[PDB]
């Protein structure tokens, strides 16, 4: 029924969701931009943007997973291990 | 027809769709104008309601109270 | 009846001669055709019984349960056949041989116009039992449930032929036609109490009687699977046909010895249906719902009206074509995975859907739905219950209500939810297989097609 | 402040309102430690076998054959008659069977009544 | 098996069991297509005490319009032939009580 | 139709009324009986029409068993077996027919509620009082004879009958 | 529904009429000559159209000759307005008849209370 | 439900479950967009105003109030995703997961079928045979002697091996199987 | 006994819609409280008005659930209210089909459901019944519409709320096809089953105005 | 075509078999098949016998 999902296409909406955050500035935003590392969040940002992202893809990411999600290609990369994308 | 999925922003849509719609929507209050023209006694009644109070006691056939 | 007897006491040889590979095929084969000349006793008349000599005879009531008798032995062929692959060709011919003794038994049984001749014969059904169930048993316990299915049996039936024997001597004779033209009323003394009580509680026991069926559960556990199939779906009608028989003489004391037996019966099919809601096995599932239909078949005979002798006879036949069924499927279930728990294997309808379809075939088959024999017995039953009494409509709703409850919940567990992950042993049905549930359903859906031949001479 | 919760058999307590979860001594640290450590070697026992490639069959559970075991073929060694048992199953085994008796008995013994004084409703009742 | 976490890998998924685990003694009642134990936004007593009070006022009120009907100040309907005797089933040899109805 | 006969099955007679329209509009439960006409009635008709031709060609009948009476339980002496085997088996086959009688009643009672439709407490009156008379008489024959019924259970309750009916005779003649 | 309701209820239900005895005084208490009422259509009648019980009221011809109308105009089915109008006048007449005997029934009970209390009240004087 | 879990839960993961929870239960109470956006800054604020303590019974006395606070103010129907627990398609295509045990007790004609998709199977079964006593070799070398503590298991040490214990999770069935 | 149930059951059902989040919940309960209604009309001995009222509920629940669905489906398998908006102008033609279908299971004057509920409510107005079954039988009517206008509120006004990868289509001929035909059923089929049906029980020609107005009013 | 293949088929020999089985079979023994009898009005013409059923007498008119 939904058209599939890709690596590049779930690559594209989480850094448009990350952009569209304020606290993360979009110009020193890669894919490998840690979190806290050198993005300077905290826990609760990075809770709210594991929540931002569920309700980007439509469903919910368990909090023993959501934890160790701190950086964008980690996100991309659960993301399209559970919904099964290979390419 | 296709209608390819949008990301943020208003769905496609068609113009069948839309006049059909309007179409229904129109016919159901036509409908419902063309019928309360004809008979409006279903809603608001046909034959009046009596009072009781207005009622004589000599057609009701009540004599006086000393007789 | 010696043109089907005998057939039997040649398919003895036939096994016994036959070559080490063609015992299934021959013994198949030669069942098939016995049973189809056995189907000629369905022509029964509307006054009397069928007198072929003075030692054999058929009646309406007779007749339905040869024809069941005889088309179960093949099935019985064919699960045996799947569970004796490593056997020796001389214990595969002596399982044959105990089978074969086993129905020419219940049909001699079946036909016999003396008590003590059927007394003689339904006890000479427990040696093949018991030698089936104790020799080709898996687990430890088929000792035990042999030894508990014998002293029951025996116990119960002991008195029965001292009361045959004293019936001889007081009135002249044992023949079911004599007894039943020339019967008079039994009077209400502690004598005749007490021979009520040998009589009925031999065929109680037979039956089983709640409070008096542990060994069924332990046999039908316990048993291989064509001991399982001939045990509850013939073995448990020895009771039934009895007790139908000997009420004739009974009378009008059974009015006032009814009651026990009657409340037992009910409250026991409640209790029954119960324990199958909590049972973590699949054939004590079964076995405790023989028990309830049998419970139910007790309280009809015990009311004893003519609308209640034909839902017994409807039900003991639906009963018996329904238990087999699903001690077949129980058996194909168990050779899966060799074990009987009932929550071990999951998803078998994503890995094995025909066998799906049987199993809610033969799930709504066991809970009373229309049209079924099943229901038309049940409902009969029900009737003369409620004329009999006005509570025992609610007895009966609330067994329906807890039949239809565990059947679904077995149905359920079994078949829906997700596989067992670790499970990968599970091959596709055998052809084998899907033809005997095939040839156990569809006789169940003709005689719902075609009523009046499983009804009884009360018909 | 807020109305409490009260937990009951069939609405147990939640782990967030459990007063025993916020206070943690440190040797529940290290029995939660233990825990986890017996988890893990049974995980670990049933992985092993469950990714055997040379494995065809069932993996026998240990646990629901003792817990088959116990249900049914255990009850009988371990029972004793004490007054709590005597008592338990003779009323749930007797007390319904004498209720019942004597409420079919009553309801038959006004039918028969009825039926001997000659005034129960039995027209057209040619069934029975 | 209900209030069991339902995010953990169980190696039973559906019926939330682990290899080797002691199995709970009414394991066969717990599972979850049966009886569920898991914790309710409000409280049991509060739960039953809601629903006992409910009913029983709805069975209150049901008999107290029961015993104060409501109506229409009308008089009972009127039928031709002694309140319709032979139409409902009057035997006809036998002479009914006669019903006149007057005009008003 | 001559298959049964008019007086065991009664059919009152049957009047239809005759159309009467009022409309200009064309009647389309007329157009579809027209078209329903031509399509099935003549072929299925035809079909007919050759299968009796058929039978016709092969004509045989059948006949109706009859059984002569004989000496009842009543004569019967005691345990002689076959006069008593005799007697049993006549009763039996009266108890049959007695059943088929009430069968008919039914059937009659059922297909006047049907045809009277609305009227049917008043008019369907005829046909109640038949069948509570032949009811009352099965009833009183074999009503509570049981499971194992025979001659001589129903020779008892008749016999219990009539003694309890002098015995009411003679306290009303007291 | 009604102010009847709350007379009867939080009032005097002596004096207001019970539905379910209705009448409780002789037709003619007060009515020098009454005229009986007309019934139009025959049992008959009635019995051919297959009237149900409940429609076989004194506005039973009205009923029939709508029936005929309906039966006979068939797949016009807005072409029985008269006669559905002719019948509806006659139920309700039948209906303001029974508002009139509750009225009736009401006053009656009325006056009765208050010839008794009069009577009452020159016992005790 | 890929990370295996830990002994126990730190008062920051906690804090953090509460917080993502109370989230979205007034997400739920607060259906419109901008209402949630407000309430929510307000929710952060309030712990962000409790953010910083030293006292750690003060911050567990606090973490006991605020579920104590949660639990009488939860919303009775919280929304809950399609595809999580309590979702209305939860557990929907579980009877369509079939396995590739299952997979290969297929007949020859139905073999030949997929003459293409059988030869990668063929080859990822030699594959999967050629690793277990490597895999086990691994898992028996690296467990401490008393057993594992954990359930994590280790990473392919070499370049020629392949994870212990990787092969159901590998092969396991499509999220959308059929 | 059937009217108290009845009475009940409608009540009960319909107070347990007006809150529910679950739209096919929410239709469940609206036929459950339409089911009490029928039982209620049986209750009063008007068992033809029962089946009259079964066939228009048949109609327009049936085409109530199939917008349902349709919404559902376009929303990737969402059932939420919660996460449903702006479909006004999102699904037009679903949109009109809910409208008329809550139109006519409120009593709109002129539309299917009319022809049943409102006789059925004036049947028991001007019955010798329960009191209290008749205040139960209003109250219900008045949660029915409420229920309805909630349906309406949280599916298709306001601003979306759905999640922003925008699958939303409902230009199959299939869907289209099925929609329209149920729905020409909800606008006309209760005139002609009205007009075409005999005359089976006695009109309530004569009743106060107020009464007359009633399901009007608390609608 | 297809609609036409399975209309013959499907509605035709179904109801072909039905008329066969309901005319000559089950309207063979009596009280197979019931029909409610048509109902009479006054002023009506009984087709059966050729009988005029009179019309009602004058009704008190109103209005
Ligand atoms: C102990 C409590 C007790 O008595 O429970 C009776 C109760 C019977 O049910 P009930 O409805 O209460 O009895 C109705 C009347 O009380 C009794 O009925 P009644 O008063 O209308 O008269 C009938 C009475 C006429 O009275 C007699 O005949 C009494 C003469 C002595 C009979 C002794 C037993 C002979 C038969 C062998 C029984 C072996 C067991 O008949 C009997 O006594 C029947 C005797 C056989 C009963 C059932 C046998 C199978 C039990 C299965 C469970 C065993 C564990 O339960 C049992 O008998 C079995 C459980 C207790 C043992
Ligand atoms: C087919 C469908 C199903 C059919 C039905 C199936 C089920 C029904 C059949 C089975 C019925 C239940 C079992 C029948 C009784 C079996 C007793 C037995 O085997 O005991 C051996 C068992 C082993 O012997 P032990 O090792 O020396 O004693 C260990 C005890 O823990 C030592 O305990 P303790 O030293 O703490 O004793 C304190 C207390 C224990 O008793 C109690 O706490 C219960 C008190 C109420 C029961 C007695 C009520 C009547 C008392 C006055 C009787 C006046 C008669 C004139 O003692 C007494 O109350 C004094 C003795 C009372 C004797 C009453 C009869 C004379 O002893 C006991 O269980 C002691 C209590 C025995 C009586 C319990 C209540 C029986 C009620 C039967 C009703 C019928
Ligand atoms: C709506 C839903 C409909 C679904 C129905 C699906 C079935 C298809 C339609 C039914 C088939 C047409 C009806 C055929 C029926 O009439 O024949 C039946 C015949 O069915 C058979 O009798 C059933 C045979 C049952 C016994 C089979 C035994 C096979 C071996 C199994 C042995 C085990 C049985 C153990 C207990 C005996 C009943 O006999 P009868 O109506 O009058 O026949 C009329 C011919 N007459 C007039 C000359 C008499
Ligand atoms: C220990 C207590 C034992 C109670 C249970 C009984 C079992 C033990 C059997 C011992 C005999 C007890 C009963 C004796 C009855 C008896 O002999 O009389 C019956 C009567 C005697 O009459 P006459 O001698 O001819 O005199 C004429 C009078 N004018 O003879 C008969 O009717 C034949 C009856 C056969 C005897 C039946 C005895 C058994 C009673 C039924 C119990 C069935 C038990 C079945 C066990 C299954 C469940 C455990
Ligand atoms: C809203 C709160 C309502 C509270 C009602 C409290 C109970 C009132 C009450 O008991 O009224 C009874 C009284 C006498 O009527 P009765 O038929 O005797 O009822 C007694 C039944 N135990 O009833 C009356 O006085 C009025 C009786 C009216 C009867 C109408 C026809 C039936
Ligand atoms: P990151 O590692 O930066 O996380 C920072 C944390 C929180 C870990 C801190 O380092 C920390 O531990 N600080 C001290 C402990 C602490 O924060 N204690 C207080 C936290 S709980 C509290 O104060 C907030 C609760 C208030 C809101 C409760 C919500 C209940 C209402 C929900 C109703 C449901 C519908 C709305």
């Not at chain 4, 069939?10 to 967030?16: D, G, H, K, S």
């Not at chain 9, 109530?64 to 449903?84: P, Y």
Request: include cysteine.
């Amino acid at each position: 029924d939904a058209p599939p999902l890709t690596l590049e296409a779930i690559k594209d909406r989480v850094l448009y969701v990350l952009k569209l955050y304020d606290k993360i500035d979009p110009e020193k935003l890669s894919v490998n931009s840690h979190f806290m590392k050198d993005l300077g969040l905290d826990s609760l940002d990075q809770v709210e943007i594991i929540m931002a992202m569920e309700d980007e893809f439509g469903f919910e990411i368990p909090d023993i997973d959501a934890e160790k999600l701190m950086c964008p290609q980690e996100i991309v990369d659960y993301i399209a291990d559970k919904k099964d994308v290979y390419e | 027809v296709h209608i390819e999925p949008r990301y943020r922003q208003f769905p496609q849509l068609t113009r069948s769709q839309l006049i059909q719609a309007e179409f229904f929507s129109a016919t159901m209050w036509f409908w419902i104008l063309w019928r309360f023209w004809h008979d409006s006694d279903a809603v608001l009644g046909h034959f009046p309601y009596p009072d009781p109070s207005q009622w004589t006691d000599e057609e009701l056939g009540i004599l006086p109270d000393d007789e | 009846m010696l043109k089907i007897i005998i057939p039997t006491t040649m398919l003895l040889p036939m096994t016994w001669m036959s070559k080490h590979n063609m015992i299934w095929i021959n013994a198949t084969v030669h069942s098939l055709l016995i049973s189809l000349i056995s189907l000629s006793l369905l022509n029964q008349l509307g006054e009397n019984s069928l007198n072929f000599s003075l030692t054999f005879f058929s009646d309406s009531l007779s007749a339905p349960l040869l024809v069941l008798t005889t088309w179960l032995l093949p099935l019985m062929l064919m699960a045996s056949q799947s569970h004796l692959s490593k056997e020796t060709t001389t214990r595969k011919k002596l399982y044959i041989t105990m089978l074969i003794l086993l129905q020419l038994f219940l049909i001699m049984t079946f036909t016999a116009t003396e008590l003590i001749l059927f007394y003689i014969l339904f006890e000479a059904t427990l040696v093949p039992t018991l030698i089936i169930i104790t020799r080709w048993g898996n687990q430890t316990e088929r000792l035990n449930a042999g030894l508990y299915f014998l002293f029951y049996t025996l116990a119960g039936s002991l008195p029965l032929l001292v009361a045959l024997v004293y019936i001889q001597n007081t009135t002249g004779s044992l023949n079911f036609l004599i007894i039943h033209y020339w019967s008079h009323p039994l009077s209400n003394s502690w004598s005749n109490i007490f021979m009520w009580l040998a009589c009925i509680m031999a065929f109680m026991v037979k039956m089983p009687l709640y409070g008096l069926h542990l060994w069924l559960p332990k046999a039908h556990v316990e048993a291989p699977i064509a001991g399982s199939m001939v045990l509850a779906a013939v073995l448990l009608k020895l009771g039934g046909y009895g007790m139908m028989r000997i009420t004739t003489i009974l009378n009008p004391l059974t009015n006032y010895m009814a009651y026990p037996f009657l409340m037992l019966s009910m409250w026991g099919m409640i209790m029954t249906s119960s324990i199958c809601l909590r049972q973590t096995d699949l054939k004590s599932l079964i076995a405790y719902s023989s028990v309830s239909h049998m419970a139910l078949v007790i309280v009809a005979i015990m009311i004893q009206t003519p609308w209640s002798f034909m839902g017994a006879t409807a039900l003991m036949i639906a009963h018996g074509l329904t238990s087999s069924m699903l001690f077949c499927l129980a058996n194909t279930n168990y050779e899966r995975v060799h074990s009987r728990t009932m929550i071990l294997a999951r998803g078998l309808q994503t890995l094995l859907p025909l066998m799906a379809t049987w199993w809610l075939v033969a799930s709504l088959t066991n809970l009373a739905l229309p049209p079924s024999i099943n229901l038309i017995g049940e409902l009969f039953i029900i009737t003369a219950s409620f004329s009999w009494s006005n509570i025992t409509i609610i007895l009966m709703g609330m067994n329906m209500m807890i039949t239809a409850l565990y059947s679904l919940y077995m149905l359920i567990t079994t078949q829906r939810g997700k596989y067992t992950h670790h499970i990968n042993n599970i091959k596709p049905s055998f052809t084998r297989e899907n033809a005997l549930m095939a040839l156990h359903i569809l006789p169940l859906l003709l005689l719902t097609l075609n009523p009046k031949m499983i009804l009884g001479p009360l018909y | 402040s807020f109305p409490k919760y009260k937990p009951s058999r069939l609405a147990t307590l939640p782990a967030t309102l459990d007063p025993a979860e916020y206070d943690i001594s440190p040797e529940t640290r290290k029995a939660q430690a233990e825990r986890l450590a017996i988890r893990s070697r049974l995980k670990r026992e049933y992985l092993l076998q469950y990714n055997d490639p040379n494995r065809l069959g069932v993996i026998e559970d240990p646990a629901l054959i003792r817990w088959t075991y116990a249900r049914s073929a255990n009850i009988y060694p371990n029972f004793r008659p004490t007054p709590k048992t005597s008592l338990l199953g003779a009323l749930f085994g007797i007390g319904p069977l004498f209720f019942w008796y004597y409420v079919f008995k009553t309801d038959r013994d006004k039918k028969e009544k009825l039926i001997q004084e000659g005034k129960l409703d039995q027209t057209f009742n040619i069934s029975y | 098996q209900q209030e069991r976490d339902p995010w953990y890998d169980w190696d039973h998924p559906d019926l939330r069991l682990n290899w080797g685990e002691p199995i709970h003694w009414d394991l066969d009642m717990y599972i979850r297509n049966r009886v569920d134990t898991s914790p309710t936004p409000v409280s049991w007593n509060t739960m039953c005490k809601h629903l006992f009070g409910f009913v029983a006022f709805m069975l209150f009120m049901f008999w107290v319009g029961e015993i104060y009907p409501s109506y229409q100040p009308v008089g009972p309907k009127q039928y031709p032939y002694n309140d319709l005797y032979l139409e409902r089933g009057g035997d006809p040899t036998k002479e009914p009580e006669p019903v006149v109805h007057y005009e008003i | 139709p001559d298959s049964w006969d008019k007086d065991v099955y009664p059919e009152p007679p049957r009047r239809t009324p005759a159309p009467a329209p009022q409309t200009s509009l064309p009647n389309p439960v007329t157009y579809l009986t027209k078209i329903f006409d031509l399509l099935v009635d003549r072929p299925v008709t035809l079909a007919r029409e050759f299968i009796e031709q058929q039978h016709a060609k092969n004509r045989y009948y059948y006949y109706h068993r009859e059984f002569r009476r004989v000496p009842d339980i009543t004569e019967c002496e005691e345990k002689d077996i076959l006069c008593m085997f005799e007697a049993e088996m006549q009763w039996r086959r009266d108890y049959k027919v007695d059943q088929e009688i009430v069968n008919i009643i039914q059937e009659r009672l059922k297909a006047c509620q049907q045809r009277e439709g609305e009227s049917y407490r008043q008019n369907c009156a005829k046909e109640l009082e038949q069948f509570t008379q032949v009811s009352k008489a099965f009833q009183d024959r074999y009503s509570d004879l049981g499971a194992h019924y025979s001659a001589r259970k129903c020779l008892a309750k008749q016999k219990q009958r009539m003694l309890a009916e002098r015995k009411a005779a003679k306290e009303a003649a007291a | 529904m009604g102010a009847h309701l709350a007379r009867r209820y939080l009032g005097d239900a002596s004096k207001e009429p019970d539905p379910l005895r209705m009448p409780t005084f002789p037709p003619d208490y007060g009515f020098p000559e009454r005229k009986e009422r007309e019934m139009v259509a025959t049992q008959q009648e009635m019995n051919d159209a297959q009237l149900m019980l409940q429609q076989r009221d004194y506005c039973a011809h009205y009923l029939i000759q709508l029936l005929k109308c309906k039966r006979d105009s068939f797949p016009n089915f807005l072409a029985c307005k008269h006669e559905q109008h002719d019948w509806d006048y006659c139920e309700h007449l039948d209906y303001v008849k029974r508002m009139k005997e509750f009225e009736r029934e009401r006053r009656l009970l009325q006056r009765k209370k208050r010839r008794e209390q009069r009577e009452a009240e020159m016992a005790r004087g | 439900a890929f990370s295996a879990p830990a002994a126990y839960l730190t008062h920051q993961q906690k804090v953090l479950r509460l917080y993502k929870r109370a989230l979205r239960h007034l997400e739920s109470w607060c259906v419109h967009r901008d209402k949630y956006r407000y309430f929510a800054c307000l929710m952060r604020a309030r712990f962000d105003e409790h953010k910083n303590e030293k006292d750690m019974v003060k911050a567990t006395q606090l973490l006991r109030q605020a579920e104590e606070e949660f639990w009488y103010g939860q919303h009775p129907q919280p929304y809950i995703f399609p595809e999580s627990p309590g979702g209305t398609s939860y557990e929907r295509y579980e009877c369509y997961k079939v396995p590739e045990w299952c997979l290969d007790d297929w007949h020859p004609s139905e073999k030949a079928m997929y003459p293409d998709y059988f030869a990668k199977r063929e080859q990822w079964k030699r594959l999967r045979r050629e690793s277990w006593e490597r895999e086990v070799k691994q898992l028996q070398e690296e467990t401490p002697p008393g057993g594992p503590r954990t359930e994590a298991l280790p990473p392919a040490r070499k370049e020629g091996d392949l994870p212990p214990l990787w092969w159901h999770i590998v092969t396991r069935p499509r999220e959308r199987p059929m | 006994m059937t009217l108290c149930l009845g009475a009940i059951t409608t009540l009960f059902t319909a107070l347990c819609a007006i809150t529910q989040n679950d739209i096919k919940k929410i239709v469940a309960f609206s036929t459950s409280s339409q089911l009490g209604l029928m039982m209620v009309t049986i209750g009063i001995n008007q068992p033809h008005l029962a089946f009259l009222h079964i066939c228009m509920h048949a109609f327009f629940k049936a085409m109530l659930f199939m917008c349902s669905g349709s919404i559902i489906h376009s929303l990737n398998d969402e059932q939420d209210i919660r996460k449903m908006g702006g479909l006004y102008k999102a699904m037009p033609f679903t949109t009109t089909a809910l409208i008329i279908g809550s139109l006519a299971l409120t009593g709109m004057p002129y539309l299917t459901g009319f022809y049943s509920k409102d006789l059925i409510i004036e049947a028991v107005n001007m019955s010798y019944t329960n009191a209290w079954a008749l205040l139960m039988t209003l109250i219900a009517t008045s949660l029915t519409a409420a229920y309805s206008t909630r349906i309406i509120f949280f599916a298709f006004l306001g601003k979306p709320r759905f999640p922003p990868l925008v699958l939303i289509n409902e230009n199959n001929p299939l869907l289209i096809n099925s929609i329209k035909r149920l729905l020409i059923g909800s606008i006309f089929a209760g005139f002609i089953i009205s007009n075409n049906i005999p005359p089976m029980t006695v009109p309530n020609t004569t009743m106060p105005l107020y009464m007359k107005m009633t399901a009007l009013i608390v609608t | 075509y297809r609609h036409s293949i399975f209309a013959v088929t499907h509605v035709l020999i179904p109801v072909w078999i039905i008329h066969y089985y309901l005319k000559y079979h089950v309207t063979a023994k009596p009280y197979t098949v019931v029909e409610r009898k048509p109902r009479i009005f006054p002023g009506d013409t009984i087709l059966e016998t050729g009988e005029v059923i009179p019309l009602m007498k004058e009704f008190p008119d109103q209005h």
